[PDB]
Amino acid sequence: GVNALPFEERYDNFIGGEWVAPVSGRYFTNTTPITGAEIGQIARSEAGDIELALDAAHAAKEKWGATSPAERANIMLKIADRMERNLELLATAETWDNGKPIRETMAADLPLAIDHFRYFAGVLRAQEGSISQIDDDTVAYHFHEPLGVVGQIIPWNFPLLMACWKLAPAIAAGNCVVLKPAEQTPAGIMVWANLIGDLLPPGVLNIVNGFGLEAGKPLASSNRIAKIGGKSPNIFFADVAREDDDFFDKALEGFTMFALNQGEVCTCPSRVLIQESIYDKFMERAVQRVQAIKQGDPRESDTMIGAQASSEQKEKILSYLDIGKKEGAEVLTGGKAADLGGELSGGYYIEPTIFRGNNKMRIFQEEIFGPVVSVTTFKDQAEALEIANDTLYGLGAGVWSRDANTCYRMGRGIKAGRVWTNCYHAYPAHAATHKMMLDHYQQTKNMLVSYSPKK
Amino acid sequence: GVNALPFEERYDNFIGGEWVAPVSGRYFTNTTPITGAEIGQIARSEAGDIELALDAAHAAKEKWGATSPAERANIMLKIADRMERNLELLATAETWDNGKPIRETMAADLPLAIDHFRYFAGVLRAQEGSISQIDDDTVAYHFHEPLGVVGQIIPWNFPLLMACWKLAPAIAAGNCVVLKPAEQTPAGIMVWANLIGDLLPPGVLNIVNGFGLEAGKPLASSNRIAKIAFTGETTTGRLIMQYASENLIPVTLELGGKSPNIFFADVAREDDDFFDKALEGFTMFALNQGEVCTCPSRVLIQESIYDKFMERAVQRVQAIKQGDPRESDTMIGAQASSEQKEKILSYLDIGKKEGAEVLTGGKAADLGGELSGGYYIEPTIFRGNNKMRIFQEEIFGPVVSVTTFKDQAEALEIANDTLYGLGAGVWSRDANTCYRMGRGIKAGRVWTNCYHAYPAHAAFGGYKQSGIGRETHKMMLDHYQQTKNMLVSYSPKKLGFF
Amino acid sequence: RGVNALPFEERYDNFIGGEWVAPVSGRYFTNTTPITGAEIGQIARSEAGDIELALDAAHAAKEKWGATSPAERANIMLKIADRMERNLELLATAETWDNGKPIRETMAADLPLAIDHFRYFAGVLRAQEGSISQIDDDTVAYHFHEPLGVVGQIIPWNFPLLMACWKLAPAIAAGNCVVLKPAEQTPAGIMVWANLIGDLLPPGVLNIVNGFGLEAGKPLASSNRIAKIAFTGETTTGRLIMQYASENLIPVTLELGGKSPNIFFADVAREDDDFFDKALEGFTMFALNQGEVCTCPSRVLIQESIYDKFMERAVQRVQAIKQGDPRESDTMIGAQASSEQKEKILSYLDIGKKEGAEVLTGGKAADLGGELSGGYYIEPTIFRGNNKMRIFQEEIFGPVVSVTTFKDQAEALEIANDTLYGLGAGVWSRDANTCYRMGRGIKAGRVWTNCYHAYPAHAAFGGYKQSGIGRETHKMMLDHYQQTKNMLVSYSPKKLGFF
Amino acid sequence: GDIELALDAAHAAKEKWGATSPAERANIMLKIADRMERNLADLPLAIDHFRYFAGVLRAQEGSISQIDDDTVAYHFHEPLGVVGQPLLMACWKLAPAIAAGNCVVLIMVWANLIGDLLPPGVLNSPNIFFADRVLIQVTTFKDQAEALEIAGAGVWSRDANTCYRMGRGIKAGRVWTNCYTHKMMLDHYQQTKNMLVSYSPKK
Ligand SMILES: [K+]
Ligand SMILES: [K+]
């Protein structure tokens, strides 16, 4: 179950379908953020193991992009189906490795990963090139070709959801991938590879591992492979507070979205704009809700918030929290670390903190990667747009309102890229993740053909 | 000169780039419905000129379909430029022959027609076949080809819009057209063909006039046409489908509709410009005398705002100005034919005696002077429940019926209670109500906080006993085309079994 | 369990609403295997009342299943395809037994194509997105894809399960509940497939009602409770169905049989290399499915001055076709789907003989000895005439191919196009310009170049002159089972100005 | 300074130009093409790309991805803003950007007539020959694979299985067969606004 260490020991690299040990023998320890207890040994590749990975990729490159789109899609579907029935194992691996809740892994990370695999198996079937009939004699054909080899550097935020988000398009398009998982949370990708890797031709899924300055730098700077987070407003208008029936409950539940996956999300809703005419009641219920979050051991059944990522995560979060506390950031809840006791002392927990202030303060124009939300207020829709667009960012935004004109005008006026409306943190496939990712890992072949013996 | 006559007294049959007198020698008189007078003689044709049109079309189809799509778009752009330079002549012709306000032809009709000829000349430039890689050895290439020769039966109520709603898709797609204008309004298409006759190559556009049993059936039952497009009455549509079910011919239709217009009490929340817009959108039944396929003639108003909405909407209806449609200012115009008055007056009688209390209007609109022989009915508002014939039969009159509901579920119930599925309008400020009403209404098109907008890029259609297809969109370019699927194999090695 | 053991059982009732319900009356007709004409079970005879039960269940599931998210329905379709792929042998044996098709042909092409078709349409469902149009700053039009509701389909018997899947995948991908009428020649294969997978779909999403094409085909087509009727079959029944479904305003989608040319240019035999073997393969492909293919290449057009070599080698390789028990893996051609069809091809052979066309091979029935005597086996027949004889202008659906010659490309186009059908065609040549010119010229919905009988999902397929309406096996089958909902939304509270 | 005031004008116009309907910008482009015809293989393609990109702008839709019964993702096609670039190239660039709703910053004589139509501030390889770099079967080669490993491109032949193989096997982006601009330009000067809207009141 979740309480048994999923990890095996001594994970080495995975190049060409076989577990290849480091060229220069080295193994850095796997420190689980949940407790800070060493849980495995991970290969430390420097510059040669990445070249073995590139060798396996360039050796399986020609036969994989030659595969049919239907056979490639069927391989992806088998990958997804074997990922499904092993849901608990991969979820437990990601929880142990990253400290995310076990509730948040069998509900939002794995099912999203499997659905991404199935989805990009489905977009490759429907994919088409294009014919342009220039005239009666000349025709232009546009085919989609794979890029070749692509190297992916997985972050530590979702080490399995984001890894699959970056793999599935690249494997659907027919490319061989060289992966370097981030050393903060390695070896959940090792577990996933040990689960699936034989389903792909040897050299399609290569996963080196090590340090960002050690392993990634030769990879990210390579003349072989063709290709290689801000403050998100959560505006609440006075509309949401007409009645206390079901949309205001949803509004509050969507306010407490900094505390899902410990705010390391790049689109963290860490800036909440509440209408002045509703601020008092909304913050009443919001403070009753944030303090109702159950912090504890991430891997039990129901811990809503777990360990962050590392020691550096805690130092950054604590530094930004203190800097906020200085300039006047009235704390409604939280505001420090959390020593939960038991085995949970070497961990890296931060408790959910509701800040309070104005967009001048540096907690609003600087991102924490932690469960720290910076509430503020605004007067009207125009001021809401003036404030919500005050940032050097825009990776996302969230608008809550019961008015059609308000929602559309906010969504179209906000300079974000993904505006949520009366929801937040829903990351479904086919919504831009979108079927246009397959074109990221594809080049185009243009053949212009003239069917006329004379000119 | 809008008040000056725009029609020659001898409109023959346009066939093969030239003016051809009918073989039967007969003719029929054209009546302007503004006054009831006579405005010219237009050729009466039968199954003999239908075949002349088909012969010209088939003699031009091979040369037309082989022209580049960039050559069939420059010609369309030149057609639109000519139609825009002469917007008043066409507006005046559509006014004299159809008897609708000159403002509605210089504002809606002609700009919409020019916009369609530009739009479908745009959609044609960006069109592209698909190439579906199957493996390294097999590739399927899909090409778009013209259907050949298409036959079109346009209706009267939009003489130059429904004619350009369907020529532009058909001429963009490389087909040659045999167009049959409705006998009730056969002159506007004639002036239009006069002014842009020489832009198209001979035989591509062939226009023949006549009645619906002598020049309509021969065109809509021929084996020389690839597709028959019809727009109008449902029974005539069944006639067309039966006639074209012998050569297995596509029969794209558009058959009326009884469109509701719902108000959810979110409009009466500030008495602001939005309430003003809702009031204006209520009276939209009077647009084109209510002889539009998407007529709001059913109105659903939330039970809490019925009193206020009526006490202002009756005022705005009583402010609708009627008169001679040919100067600058008439809002509600004249009916197309005398039989149109006859049907509408019979329907008004049925509504009066059924139990639909008359909020306003309810009789003819004798305007005196040189308008007594005209065809004018006063804009009318009744009030009943949905189980009454005025709610459940189309009128094409300046008539609307009003009933109320309790809540959104009842709104969907009543809005779907009819047998037609063409259109509907929704008026609310709440997003969830607007979406659930737009998606729950079993109609091909739903207007939310607007109505009677016909942009060239929004697919117009209905899915009930109201037709098959989608106008005003790039999907309609494919309705006049067919797919050639060339599945090439490149491996020169046998599969291994006979 | 085995290919040579019976794969059916007796009393296949109607599969209505995730159930097995008997007809309104105990009317039960009898299925009969073409391989050895004999009973292989007793099939329910469906009157109009069973169509009414099927439509009721389809409407209930239309209410519910309609709003099932595209990702859930695609998951159900993927699970259906996986279940079929893990039972490919059982389904293929059922198809061989009920249709007389060789087990070779089923296990090789027919069941893999059905599984690939379900996977393909689950995919194109996941990848399907509607449309938006920014009319101006204040008005947007939203084009939603919606289910049609309940659709009805009448499947032929030449490809019972393959056409059942070809029609079912887009229909249930699009959220449409289906009432499905199997051809009474081959009723019991769809039953086996249904009892296989009749637990992955919600009750009512798939309803299959088996009966005679006049007792049950008409009540299904003559119903206002279906948003569409789909048909594949003979042009007489196609015109009938067009009549019944035009009296109700419901759109129709036909796919009628065509007399498909198969042109062989004098370049196929230049170097008599493996490409020439492929061309002879393609010529012999007239006997695939025992000629019962709506796109059968039963009209071969060989260039005049290559005729000698091609016909000597091709008659050799057609005599080499091994006729035997279709349940043997070595058998290359099976039985005819019914005795009436065997009589039809025999009559057309006699017409061709009486019309002055020589017979190069075959020409009669065949008694394959043993229990196969009762079966309906026509010997692969080659005729030889010109384009004007009846057998060149009329459709046979038998292992019968008629051969003529052309002089140049223009005569090739004239002979290829001189017909009343445009369903399919085939063009064998090595010249690059010839293949494209001949594929563009030929009035055929599908044109195979340098191959033939390739039906890969995601390639469009339809009748081009008079042999049907619409396209199949492509992602735009989804649009044939969906309607567009336009929602024009104005975000400006400013009045229009007029009125 | 001069470029700075060009940028300031471009932003001031960008406030309003992006509000213009696709129909109206396409119509302005058609008027530009007409006016260029009046004052007319370089100008033909310039006019032709103005018409073509007006057409693609009229055709462009945007997606309405349906995630659930109660959740829809809308993919609008917002303009970027201000962008910066003989006359044929000038047009290949301006025609798409102006189509997308962008106030460009930059021919002179052409700019004199085109400028007034726009609102102010908006405008401111081997050559293989297969026997039936010049790779004649100038240099030479032996067989198909020979000229494949030697080697957008260009391929004269007639075998219909070497034209395809040699068109697909070349590591380039454009192969011309028996001889010797795209909607994807309009999506390069144009950004996507994804609006995920949830229509469920419950949670
Ligand atoms: K008239
Ligand atoms: K049978």
Numbering used by the authors:
A (entry chain C): 11 to 238, 266 to 469, 482 to 504
B (entry chain B): 11 to 508
C (entry chain A): 10 to 508
D (entry chain D): 58 to 97, 118 to 162, 169 to 189, 199 to 216, 269 to 276, 308 to 312, 412 to 425, 433 to 461, ...
The article reads:
Enzyme assays revealed that EtgA readily oxidizes glycolaldehyde, albeit with a 2.5-fold lower catalytic efficiency than acetaldehyde. In contrast, the inter-dimer contacts show energetically unfavorable ΔG values of +2.3 and +4.5 kcal/mol, consistent with weak contacts between the ‘dimer-of-dimers’, resulting in flexibility and a weak definition of the cryo-EM map. EtgA is structurally similar to other bacterial aldehyde dehydrogenases and has a canonical active site with catalytic Cys and Glu residues. The aldehyde dehydrogenase EtgA efficiently converts glycolaldehyde into glycolate, enabling the subsequent conversion of glycolate to glyoxylate, which then enters central carbon metabolism via the BHAC.
Here, we show that Paracoccus denitrificans assimilates ethylene glycol solely via NAD-dependent alcohol and aldehyde dehydrogenases. We report the functional and structural characterization of EtgB and EtgA, key enzymes encoded by this etg gene cluster. We hypothesized that the alcohol dehydrogenase EtgB can convert ethylene glycol into glycolaldehyde, which is subsequently further converted into glycolate by the aldehyde dehydrogenase EtgA. The cryo-EM structures of EtgA and EtgB, determined at 3.1 and 3.0 Å resolution, respectively, provide a detailed insight into the active site of these enzymes and a starting point for structure-guided mutagenesis.
